[PDB]
Design an enzyme around this catalytic site. Structure first.
Site, PDB file in Angstrom:
ATOM      1  N   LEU A  13       0.666  -1.235  -0.119  1.00  0.00           N
ATOM      2  CA  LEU A  13       0.005  -0.078   0.108  1.00  0.00           C
ATOM      3  C   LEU A  13       0.822   1.323  -0.058  1.00  0.00           C
ATOM      4  O   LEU A  13       2.118   1.024  -0.178  1.00  0.00           O
ATOM      5  CB  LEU A  13      -0.915  -0.054   1.204  1.00  0.00           C
ATOM      6  CG  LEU A  13      -1.794  -1.271   1.320  1.00  0.00           C
ATOM      7  CD1 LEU A  13      -2.563  -1.162   2.766  1.00  0.00           C
ATOM      8  CD2 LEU A  13      -2.585  -1.335   0.024  1.00  0.00           C
ATOM      9  N   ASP A  14       0.221   2.520  -0.123  1.00  0.00           N
ATOM     10  CA  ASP A  14       0.903   3.594  -0.136  1.00  0.00           C
ATOM     11  C   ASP A  14       0.172   4.534   1.025  1.00  0.00           C
ATOM     12  O   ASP A  14      -0.465   4.036   1.897  1.00  0.00           O
ATOM     13  CB  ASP A  14       0.758   4.390  -1.358  1.00  0.00           C
ATOM     14  CG  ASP A  14      -0.648   4.781  -1.794  1.00  0.00           C
ATOM     15  OD1 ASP A  14      -1.401   3.872  -1.757  1.00  0.00           O
ATOM     16  OD2 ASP A  14      -0.766   5.994  -2.057  1.00  0.00           O
ATOM     17  N   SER A  15       1.084   5.641   1.171  1.00  0.00           N
ATOM     18  CA  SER A  15       0.641   6.491   2.493  1.00  0.00           C
ATOM     19  C   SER A  15      -0.779   7.007   2.431  1.00  0.00           C
ATOM     20  O   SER A  15      -1.458   7.042   3.538  1.00  0.00           O
ATOM     21  CB  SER A  15       1.564   7.804   2.422  1.00  0.00           C
ATOM     22  N   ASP A  18      -3.446   5.116   1.405  1.00  0.00           N
ATOM     23  CA  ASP A  18      -4.204   4.174   1.847  1.00  0.00           C
ATOM     24  C   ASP A  18      -3.995   4.085   3.337  1.00  0.00           C
ATOM     25  O   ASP A  18      -4.909   3.401   4.018  1.00  0.00           O
ATOM     26  CB  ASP A  18      -3.567   2.754   1.157  1.00  0.00           C
ATOM     27  CG  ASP A  18      -3.661   2.783  -0.389  1.00  0.00           C
ATOM     28  OD1 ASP A  18      -4.022   3.619  -0.785  1.00  0.00           O
ATOM     29  OD2 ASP A  18      -3.082   1.883  -1.074  1.00  0.00           O
ATOM     30  N   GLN A  19      -2.749   4.172   3.965  1.00  0.00           N
ATOM     31  CA  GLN A  19      -2.634   4.218   5.384  1.00  0.00           C
ATOM     32  C   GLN A  19      -3.491   5.261   5.935  1.00  0.00           C
ATOM     33  O   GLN A  19      -4.245   4.893   7.095  1.00  0.00           O
ATOM     34  CB  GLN A  19      -1.131   4.496   5.780  1.00  0.00           C
ATOM     35  CG  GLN A  19      -0.792   4.163   7.033  1.00  0.00           C
ATOM     36  CD  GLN A  19      -0.643   4.913   8.089  1.00  0.00           C
ATOM     37  OE1 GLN A  19      -0.743   6.202   7.863  1.00  0.00           O
ATOM     38  NE2 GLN A  19      -0.583   4.567   9.358  1.00  0.00           N
TER      39      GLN A  19
END
Ligand code: CDL
Ligand code: CDL
Ligand code: PLX
Ligand code: PEE
Ligand code: PEE
Ligand code: 8Q1
Lengths: 124, 88, 110, 52, 128, 67, 80, 98, 55, 55, 459, 178
Positions: free
Chosen positions: B42-44, B46-47
């Protein structure tokens, strides 16, 4: 109502002033005016302690309504005929006030017509 | 009375429940120890969305400075347990 | 007004207590079926507040509006009173629609 | 004091002050029980025109 | 593109709309580092006494002492008679006194000369 | 009455609350219908509003413009 | 006591406005990866709700039936 | 991104300590070691207070003039006065607009 | 934890409001006026650890 | 009031987004009355209380 | 009247011959008994005063003040013994001797028939107060405070003395009864204007009038607790009482000589209430509140009406009790944390609930909540002022608002919010402190049941 | 709140915080869930459109107009969680939080109740007393001579050490103390 539109947007000089009326004599257009009579005496209203604004020409019906309410206290649904009679008398009083308003405006319009048209026939 | 006292198992189950409803995560290879970046790819953004979903789940929001570093389900469970005074 | 305003506040309080001390209508979903007695009470209170005939608010509010309409009164004041009367139904509608209609918008632990 | 970060771990959380840091001359005016200078969604001088 | 927000004294400029936070130079970064270092040194100094088991009482804060002293006892030694201070003192200290004197004297002169004329309607005024 | 949370499901309801809510809604509606059947004038007015234009000059005392 | 969470495989966006959102997003080249987290608000006991006028008329049928019975009693009593 | 190893280890140690502290806030089954008529409400909270107030009003307050003043009752036409036996006549024969 | 104090405060407000309603002179009515004001102050700031409540 | 409010509330279901009007901002922020009257007079009074009366 | 004076004098050898561990008990018990005896002076006549002898007389104005003094001595002894524990036996006895001498001078001052005797005792009260402040005050500023307390008073009182002897040269007597019966109007002349100023300005300084008040914050802040209690509760009233006695010879001059003092009192009442809103020191706030209340008392005395005199008497008594209680409340926290900064110790309601209740009741009486005698006096003065001129309400009402605003402010700052974390030495309230608060507050509330007992001669 | 702040926020952090604020205010505007999901996907797409920009001047100016648009179009009354700083239950239970040292001032009669609790309390006090000096020594050893640079604290590193300055973190009153 439309009377406000006539007084404010139309010619106010042809419209009655609620604060200052009637201006014409009460016996002006009538040949014989019967003076409005009262049923309840001053003492009867004073003893009933009605109110200074309830002591109008409809006070006798209000007195009977109050007496009926006091007499059949537990049954608060029994003073219907008396309430209806008092309401009808107040309604007749209001209709009389409307009649006075209409009479005074008609008189004032007729006055303006007669005065300025006798001037019109008097200027030539 | 009010809500029952919260437990570690309940917190973990609800965190995994929310994560398994995320489309970008394989439900079967998701573990409590899975890194959002290294393992799940995932990427930031998504976080950020995962943190917001957790806040909606538990009815309280996590400050950004704390939320930036919750990179696995166990970290979120530990953070919630420490915030809400859960010891068992 | 004492009756139905106090009842409306207690209905709001029951909603708030049920939804873990949440007071924002944007997080209150469909409580019409989930809180039936509260829904009934708040519906009746909002009807009384708006002057629905033959309810507690009618015998008071109905007469006040008639008396303002039939008196030698400031015209701007009368217009403002009528507009406020419409706005009363407006915000009662807002409360009912957002708190009781539609789909749930509260946290999943019910 | 209302403009300070509420998510910082202040030594005095209610006052949002840290021990030893210089104190504003008008602290007792800005204690957040009182005068607030926080940014508003609508500009000052635009709220004033609409209200007036 | 959108209407611009302008700050005021009682509605200040938000941080996200502040250009100073977007024009960053190495000196700005080093100044921020120094500020963080000062804050951290103060924080450690406070926390070493806060967590001390043998510490009982009040942790004296020199900043609070300085604030109260500056607000009370440091003021007169730093006062200088200036046209600005002289006019402000004269106005704020004396102007209200004559303003209220004029208002009250005018009101009482009216009331007294109106009593003299016998037209005040003082009936039922027996308590004073 | 012990009621448990349900986690993303409609809550458990009792019969008492449903029947009381329905009863009081029905009571309000019956009261409104009954009062309107017996006291309709309170909404509709009981006395007719007169039209001032339907009033003749004789009964209001206006002379025919030549006196 | 000790409730357990319902199986997560049941939460589907099909048949709900979330499906409409998904298709209007696909018409733009996008996808919504959080719809199943929202599906429970539409799935079960919250599937259907009343309208505003229907909520206002909550107990109108029973009250009207009682009112009809009462007026019929008034009709059939006053003839003695 | 994420915790530093020192941060994570410190958080774990603090978490263990805090959980033991919260566990130690629990009470053992004996912790609070404590050292060693149906209508009675309406007679002490209603009947007794109304006895004192009625006694106080009847024999002390009304012993002075104008302390308890009532507005006189309304009198209507046709009423009979209890005090003197006087009868008020009726009200002037309405026109009876029925 | 202070529900007893809460009920006492509600009763105190009710007593002050009854004093206000039944007062026959302006001094007693002022007593009721200020009593309900003070009870309102005490009940608005019930959670006195909250800054907004005190404000 | 019922019909207009119901229509405007039902339009919130549409998949349309628009930035708020200025009339809406005036209504929601309470005519800006607490934003101005709770900041300007209080600030000026406290400022004069310190700068002029005290110092 | 000697039945009060002689036991008070006997308090001195009793404390000087007591055992080292018995001084406080003996002094407290016997001062309480003296207060009980003095409570019999409250039986007043109406027509005229109680004239015990050629030297001493009691009035409906003097008797409440005497009772307040005799009641304040035991409270001061109770409040002093905590911070004087480490003191030696001889210095403790000397402190008690200062308190006893102050009470003796005040008791003789409030009952002297003759104005020179009143003046001599009025000045004699200065010396014990000065010694108390400058010997047992805590900070280095106390010395300066003492000087401010001294030369402000004397610079006002030295002209008064001259005026007094001048009066006795022309009138032939300074006996107050003779002065009142043989009173004559003052003509409109420069000599009369300056004699009026000499007769008034000493009591003005003692009130203190706004603009002559700078000694009060210093002296009340730097003094020990018993010093602050007696300075606020009784000593300030020495001005008011004095004015109420001396205005009988100043008519009709006061009709226009009072305008500057009325303007100063009203505006400075607003000013001092506003000053209370921005104050970092908790004792300074109480001192400035005293200044504002005394300004209202000055207005009442200057307008010279029966309602204003009654209101001034009631407000003097009520403020004495309330200000003494507030000073004691602040001193409890000061002894807790050894600082007078108001924001240092916060959230104290969590840690000290009963003391929080005491704080609340004191704050309520400070803002004159009905039906307390504080509001009785304030309302009487406001009604008289409204009769004097209807515009006065604008200032008076404003004062009311500001008063509430700072009172609750104090209450909110010290009691509410969250506690300061690092302050961990806040011990539970002692029985002595709770009893002192109760002995302040209960008489104040009981005075509501019998207000006339403090309404003065004009009742 | 639990993490020590740094000297400044990176561009990546600022962008993420703007994303979170914009999504929350959009949810405040879009009350209903399906509409919010639609417009949040649109926001995410518009946000991803510039994810791979290389010129940091261009990225910074894009962030500037994004902030300007947010400030113009923010919700004046955004949703706040009840216990968040602007919420309706923010500091509601602070008056029920009593510091642990108050327990030392209880009367012996009060401590006669709860004997086991006070035995464990004495154990905890002994632990703190025995660990303090080692904590101080570890803090002195690990701190550069120019004073600490951030507010981060080290963990315990030996066999039986405790993390320095742990007492007041561990003995927090509670979130729902009563
Ligand atoms: C008819 C309906 C009108 C509104 C419908 C509409 O168009 O909505 C879109 C829009 C809503 O804004 P939005 O951006 O879409 O809101 C964002 C979302 O809606 C946010 O969504 P939301 O979730 O927050 O919900 C929105 C919410 C709230 O919606 C809003 O946001 C709008 C807020 C204000 C509109 C409400 C209308 C009430 C106006 C009262 C004004 C009184 C005079 C004050 C004079 C002030 C002068 C400056 O909606 C409601 O709850 C219901 C709103 C009202 C519905 C019922 C209205 C009935 C009462 C009025 C009519 C009376 C009928 C009977 C007449 C009786 C006597 C004859 O409304 C408007 O733009 C119209 C504004 C103009 C109204 C006229 C105001 C009078 C004075 C104007 C100036 C006069 C002087 C000249 C200049 C100065 C010279 C010196
Ligand atoms: C109006 C109700 C009438 C009730 C009849 C019986 C009243 C008996 C009261 C006797 C006097 C109280 C003694 C004062 C010191 C308090 C002692 C104490 O430490 O309490 C601990 C005690 C033990 O509790 P705890 O659990 O161990 O711990 C306590 C904690 O500290 C935490 O404690 P807390 O947080 O629960 O607070 C304790 C309490 C105590 O703190 C207070 O603030 C109470 C003091 C009242 C305010 C005083 C200054 C304001 C000026 C008003 C002056 C009134 C004087 C009247 C004559 C007084 C005669 C002594 O504070 C409050 O509850 C809230 C106070 C708000 C009351 C506002 C009153 C406004 C005017 C009301 C009407 C006044 C005139 C009546 C007639 C008018 C026409 C019909 O707590 C209590 O028992 C509560 C006290 C009772 C509440 C009294 C409230 C109204 C009474 C006012 C005077 C009574 C007039 C009687 C004439 C007939 C009516
Ligand atoms: C910080 C606060 C300290 C306390 C303040 C105390 C205030 C005391 C002020 C005294 C008030 C009035 C004093 C005398 C009354 C009238 C004064 C004068 O101005 O009025 C005119 C007086 O006329 C002239 O103005 C003469 C006075 C001017 C010379 C005096 C100098 C005033 C300058 C201000 C000095 C500051 C004083 C305070 C110093 C600290 C009236 O004219 P007229 O009716 O025909 O004469 C009346 C006197 N007669 C009857 C005996 C003949
Ligand atoms: C005669 C007097 C008339 C009044 C004149 C103006 C009075 C000015 C009072 C100054 C007081 C300043 C000191 C107060 C201390 C500071 C303070 O109170 O804090 C401000 C505090 C906190 O802000 P909040 O919005 O509540 O919460 C935000 C927190 N997140 O807010 C306040 O309480 C401020 C209140 C000030 C009110 C002033 C405006 C009122 C004036 C009304 C005039 C019109 C009268 C109506 C007449 C009607 C005709 C019958
Ligand atoms: C805290 C600071 C307070 C300062 C107080 C200072 C003001 C005191 C008032 C004046 C003091 C001296 C007045 C003397 C006592 C009056 C007695 C008297 O009646 O004598 C007058 C005489 O009056 C005087 O001589 C007084 C003149 C002033 C002399 C000293 C000047 C000092 C400065 C004057 C202004 C300051 C006074 C007011 C200050 C207000 C407070 C700040 C008349 O006597 P005869 O000579 O017989 O005349 C009869 C025929 N007409
Ligand atoms: C609803 C009320 C108000 C709404 C208005 C809000 C307006 C906003 C509109 C759109 C915002 C933008 O264009 S935002 C423009 C910002 N530009 C850049 O970020 C370029 C460089 N990219 C990076 O730094 C990283 O890729 C990063 C993106 C951080 C992700 O990183 P992770 O993968 O490591 O998480």
């Amino acid at each position: 109502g439309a009377h406000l539109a006539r007084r404010y947007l139309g010619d106010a000089s042809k419209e009655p002033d609620p604060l200052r009326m009637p201006t014409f004599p009460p016996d002006y257009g009538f040949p014989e005016r019967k003076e409005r009579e009262m049923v309840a005496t001053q003492q009867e209203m004073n003893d009933a302690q009605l109110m200074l604004q309830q002591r109008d020409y409809c006070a006798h019906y209000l007195i009977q309504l109050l007496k009926c309410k006091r007499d059949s206290f537990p049954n608060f649904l029994a003073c219907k005929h008396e309430q209806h009679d008092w309401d009808y008398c107040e309604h007749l009083d209001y209709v009389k006030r409307m009649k006075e308003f209409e009479r005074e405006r008609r008189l004032l319009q007729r006055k303006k017509r007669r005065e300025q048209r006798e001037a019109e026939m008097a200027r030539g | 009375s009010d809500a029952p006292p919260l437990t570690l198992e309940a917190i973990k189950d609800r965190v995994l429940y929310v994560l398994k409803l995320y489309d970008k995560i394989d439900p079967e290879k998701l573990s409590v120890n899975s890194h959002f970046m290294k393992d799940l790819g995932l990427d930031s953004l998504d976080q950020v969305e995962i943190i917001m979903a957790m806040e909606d789940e538990f009815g309280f929001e996590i400050p950004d400075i704390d939320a930036e570093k919750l990179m696995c389900p166990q970290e979120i469970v530990d953070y919630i347990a420490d915030k809400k005074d859960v010891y068992e | 007004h004492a009756f139905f305003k106090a009842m409306l506040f207690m209905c709001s309080g029951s909603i708030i207590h049920s939804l873990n001390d949440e007071q924002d209508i944007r997080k209150m979903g469909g409580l019409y079926k989930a809180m039936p007695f509260t829904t009934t009470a708040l519906i009746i209170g909002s009807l009384a507040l708006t002057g629905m005939p033959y309810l507690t608010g009618f015998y008071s509010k109905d007469l006040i509006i008639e008396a303002v309409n039939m008196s030698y009164t400031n015209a701007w004041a009368l217009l403002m009173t009528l507009i406020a009367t419409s706005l009363t139904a407006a915000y009662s509608t807002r409360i009912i629609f957002f708190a009781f209609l539609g789909k749930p918008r509260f946290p999943p632990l019910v | 004091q209302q403009e300070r970060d509420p998510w910082y771990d202040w030594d005095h959380p209610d006052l949002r002050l840290n021990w030893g840091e210089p104190i504003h001359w008008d602290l007792d005016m800005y204690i957040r029980n009182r005068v607030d200078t926080s940014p508003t969604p609508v500009s000052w001088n635009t709220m004033c025109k609409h209200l007036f | 593109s959108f209407p611009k927000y302008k700050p005021s004294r009682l509605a200040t400029l938000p941080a996200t709309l502040d250009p100073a936070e977007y024009d960053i130079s190495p000196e700005t970064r080093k100044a921020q580092a120094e500020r963080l270092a000062i804050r951290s040194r103060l924080k450690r100094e406070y926390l070493l006494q806060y967590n001390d088991p043998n510490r009982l009482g009040v942790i004296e804060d020199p900043a609070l002492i300085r604030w109260t002293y500056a607000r009370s006892a440091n003021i007169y030694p730093n006062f200088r008679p200036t046209p600005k201070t002289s006019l402000l003192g004269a106005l704020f200290g004396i102007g209200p006194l004559f303003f209220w004197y004029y208002v009250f004297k005018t009101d009482r002169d009216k009331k007294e000369k109106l009593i003299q004329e016998g037209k005040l309607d003082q009936t039922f005024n027996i308590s004073y | 009455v012990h009621i448990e949370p349900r986690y993303r499901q409609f809550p458990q309801l009792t019969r008492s609350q449903l029947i009381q809510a329905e009863f009081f809604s029905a009571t309000m509606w019956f009261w409104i219908l009954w009062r309107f059947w017996h006291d309709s004038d309170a909404v509709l007015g009981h006395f007719p509003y007169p039209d001032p234009s339907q009033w003749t000059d004789e009964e209001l005392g206006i002379l025919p413009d030549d006196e | 006591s000790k409730m357990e969470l319902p199986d997560y495989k049941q939460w589907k966006i099909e048949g709900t406005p979330l499906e409409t959102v998904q298709e209007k997003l696909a018409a733009r080249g996008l996808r919504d990866p959080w719809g199943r987290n929202e599906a429970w608000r539409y799935s079960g006991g919250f599937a259907n709700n009343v309208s505003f006028v229907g909520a206002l008329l909550k107990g109108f049928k029973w009250g009207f039936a009682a009112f009809v019975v009462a007026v019929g009693a008034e009709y059939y009593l006053e003839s003695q | 991104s994420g915790y530093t190893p020192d941060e994570k280890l410190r958080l774990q140690q603090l978490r263990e300590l805090r959980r033991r502290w919260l566990k130690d806030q629990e009470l053992s089954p004996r912790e609070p070691v404590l050292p060693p008529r149906h209508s009675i409400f309406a007679v002490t909270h209603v009947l007794i207070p109304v006895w004192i107030i009625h006694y106080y009003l009847k024999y002390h307050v009304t012993a002075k003039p104008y302390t308890v003043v009532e507005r006189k009752p309304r009198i209507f036409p046709g009423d009979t006065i209890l005090e003197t036996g006087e009868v008020i006549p009726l009200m002037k024969e309405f026109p009876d607009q029925h | 934890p202070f529900i007893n104090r809460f009920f006492k405060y509600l009763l105190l407000f009710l007593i002050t409001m009854m004093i206000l309603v039944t007062a026959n002179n302006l001094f007693q009515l002022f007593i009721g006026w200020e009593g309900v004001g003070i009870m309102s102050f005490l009940l608005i700031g019930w959670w006195h650890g909250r800054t907004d409540a005190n404000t | 009031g019922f019909m207009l409010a119901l229509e405007l509330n039902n339009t919130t279901y549409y998949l349309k987004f628009k930035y708020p009007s200025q009339t809406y901002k005036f209504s929601n922020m309470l005519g800006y009355y607490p934003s101005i009257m709770h900041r300007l007079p209080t600030y000026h009074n406290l400022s004069m209380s310190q700068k002029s009366a005290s110092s | 009247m000697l039945k009060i004076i002689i036991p008070t004098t006997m308090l001195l050898p009793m404390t000087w011959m007591s055992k080292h561990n018995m001084i406080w008990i003996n002094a407290t018990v016997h001062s309480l008994l003296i207060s009980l005896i003095s409570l019999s002076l409250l039986n007043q006549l109406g027509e005229n005063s109680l004239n015990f002898s050629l030297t001493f007389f009691s009035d409906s104005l003097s008797a409440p003040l005497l009772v307040l003094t005799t009641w304040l001595l035991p409270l001061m002894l109770m409040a002093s013994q905590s911070h004087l524990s480490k003191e030696t036996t001889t210095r403790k006895k000397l402190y008690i001797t200062m308190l006893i001498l102050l009470q003796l001078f005040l008791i003789m001052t409030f009952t002297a028939t003759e104005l020179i005797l009143f003046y001599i005792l009025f000045e004699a009260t200065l010396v014990p107060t000065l010694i108390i402040i400058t010997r047992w005050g805590n900070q280095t500023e106390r010395l300066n405070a003492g000087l401010y307390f001294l030369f402000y008073t004397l610079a006002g009182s030295l002209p008064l003395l001259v005026a007094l002897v001048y009066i006795q040269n022309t009138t032939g007597s300074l006996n107050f009864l003779i002065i009142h019966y043989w009173s004559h109007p003052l003509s409109n002349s420069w000599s009369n204007i300056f004699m009026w100023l000499a007769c008034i300005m000493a009591f003005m300084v003692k009130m203190p009038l706004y603009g002559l008040h700078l000694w009060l914050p210093k002296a009340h802040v730097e003094a020990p607790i018993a010093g602050s209690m007696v300075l606020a509760a009784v000593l300030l009233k020495l001005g008011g009482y004095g004015m109420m006695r001396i205005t009988t010879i100043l008519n009709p001059l006061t009709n226009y000589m009072a305008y500057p003092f009325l303007m100063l009192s009203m505006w400075g009442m607003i000013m001092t209430s506003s000053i209370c809103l921005r104050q970092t020191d908790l004792k300074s706030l109480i001192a400035y509140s005293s200044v504002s209340h005394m300004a209202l008392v000055i207005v009442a005395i200057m307008i010279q009406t029966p309602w204003s005199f009654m209101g001034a008497t009631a407000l003097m008594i009520a403020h004495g009790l309330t200000s003494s209680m507030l000073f004691c409340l602040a001193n409890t926290n000061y002894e807790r944390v050894h600082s007078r900064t108001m924001i240092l110790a916060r959230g104290l309601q969590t840690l000290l609930p009963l003391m929080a209740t005491w704080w609340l009741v004191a704050s309520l009486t400070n803002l004159a909540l009905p039906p307390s005698i504080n509001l009785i006096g304030e309302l009487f003065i406001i009604t008289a002022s409204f009769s004097w001129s209807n515009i006065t309400i604008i200032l008076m009402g404003m004062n009311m608002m500001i008063t509430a605003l700072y009172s609750l402010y104090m209450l909110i700052t010290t009691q509410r919010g969250k506690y300061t974390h690092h302050i961990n030495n806040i011990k539970p309230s002692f029985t002595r402190e709770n009893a002192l608060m109760a002995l302040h507050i209960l008489p104040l509330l009981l005075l509501t049941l019998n207000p006339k007992m403090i309404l003065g001669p004009l009742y | 709140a639990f993490s020590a702040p740094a000297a400044y926020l990176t561009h990546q952090q600022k962008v993420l915080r703007l994303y979170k604020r914009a999504l929350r205010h959009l949810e405040s505007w879009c009350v209903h869930r399906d509409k919010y999901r639609y417009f949040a996907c649109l926001m995410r797409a518009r946000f991803d459109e510039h994810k791979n920009e290389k010129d940091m001047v261009k990225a910074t100016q894009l962030l500037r107009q994004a902030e300007e648009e947010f400030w113009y179009g923010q919700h004046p009354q955004p949703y706040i969680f009840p216990e968040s700083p602007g919420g309706t239950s923010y500091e509601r239970y602070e008056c029920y939080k009593v510091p642990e040292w108050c327990l030392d001032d209880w009367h012996p009669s009060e401590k006669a109740m709860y004997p086991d609790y006070f035995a464990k309390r004495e154990q905890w006090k002994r632990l703190r007393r025995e660990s303090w000096e080692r904590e101080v020594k570890q803090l002195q050893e690990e701190t550069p001579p120019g004073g600490p640079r951030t507010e981060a604290l080290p963990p315990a590193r030996k066999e039986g050490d405790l993390p320095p300055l742990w007492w007041h973190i561990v003995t927090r009153p509670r979130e729902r103390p009563m």
